Structures are given as C-alpha cells and as structure tokens.
Ligand binder design. Structure first.
Ligand SMILES: c1cc(NC[C@H]2CCCO2)ccn1
Length: 185
C-alpha cells in the first residue's frame, strides 16, 4: 500500500483504560497487569474487557498507524466512535460503533455482525490501520507480509468522532502477557 505518508502519532489515554492495564510512560505501549493497577474508577473506563482508547480524535481526513502484536495469542484492534458503551458486555460490530479485526484461538476475524473469517498465510507481527473519514473506509494491512491487505470495511457510517481502539486480551493461558506497542513512524 501507499498510505504511509498519512502516518499519525497515536498515544494511549490512561483515563479510558480498564483498571488492570499498565500503560508505559511514553503512552505508546499497553499490557495486561496481574492485578488491579490501583487507579480510581470513572465513567470512561472499559469495565468488562482489557480495552483502552487512543487520545486522538478524528472527524476528517486520512490517518494511518501501526501496532506491534508480536507473540500475542489474542487481541482486538481498529477504531471506534468516541461514544461507544464502556460498561457491561457488548460485541464489537459497526452497529455498536466499532471497526475492528482480532486474533482469537489461532484464527483471525473481522468484527462484522456476524464476524467474517480472514485469510492470513503469514501471521502478522505488526498491523497497519488506515482510516479515510470522508470515504467511510477502514483498512487493515499485514506489515510482516509486505503490507498485504487483510480487510476493508467500506460504506462505514462513523456517525461521530473516531478514536483508535485496542484490546490486549485476557491472559488465562499464561501465553498472552506481551504488550501492544505503537510502532515509530
Ligand atoms: C479475569 C477477570 C479480570 N477482571 C478484571 C479486569 C480485567 C479486564 C476486565 O476487568 C481479571 C483477570 N482475570
């Protein structure tokens, strides 16, 4: 792809994080802690899942960023509306304000409703995410496989400002402790 020149510097918003997440000093990495991280509760925190938002809000233009997922067994990545539900149970779908892909149990899927199987020959270690606000497009790229296309959501109805979206996943297995990292430009 040729989206690299739309690169944006994303940082994580601590205030939105589930209370078990640990965000690095530079706000560029996030991982699952083994306990509550001793923060107060607030209406912005995702309560039920190990999720966090980027601080940046997008309402126009073209934006691109990359995320490192090396050695993880489970994660969700993409964008979401600023006004998505934070508390309780919900599914990741465009109807609920999410445009996402994930890894779960050795398969990759797009967060449509119902979910769509992805066809990935080279398991990615870094994911590229492209948003074209005006066109209503969210695309995902396999950086490990020379930028090959993973998935495109088109005809998106964003219906609000967008924020970068992250889920580090649970670590019931002991094999999913590794962080998500925002990769340098
Ligand atoms: C199972 C459930 C846990 N709940 C506390 C936090 C983590 C994400 C959702 O809320 C923590 C660890 N194992």
């Amino acid at each position: 792809h040729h989206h690299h020149h739309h690169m944006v510097h994303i940082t994580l918003d601590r205030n939105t994080a589930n209370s078990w997440l640990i965000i690095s000093k530079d706000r560029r990495q996030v991982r699952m802690g083994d306990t509550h991280q001793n923060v107060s509760d607030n209406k912005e925190r995702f309560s039920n899942y190990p999720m966090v938002l980027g601080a940046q809000r997008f309402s126009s233009g073209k934006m691109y960023w990359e995320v490192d997922v090396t050695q993880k067994e489970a994660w969700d990545l993409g964008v979401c509306r600023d006004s998505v539900q934070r508390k309780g149970q919900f599914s990741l779908s465009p109807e609920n304000g999410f445009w996402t892909i994930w890894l779960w149990q050795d398969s990759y899927e797009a967060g449509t409703s119902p979910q769509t199987t992805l066809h990935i020959q080279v398991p990615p270690c870094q994911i590229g995410i492209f948003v074209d606000y005006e066109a209503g497009v969210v695309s995902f790229y396999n950086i490990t496989d020379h930028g090959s296309l993973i998935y495109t959501f088109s005809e998106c109805v964003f219906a609000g400002p967008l924020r970068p979206f992250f889920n580090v996943g649970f670590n019931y297995s002991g094999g999913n402790a590794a962080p998500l990292k925002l990769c340098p430009l």
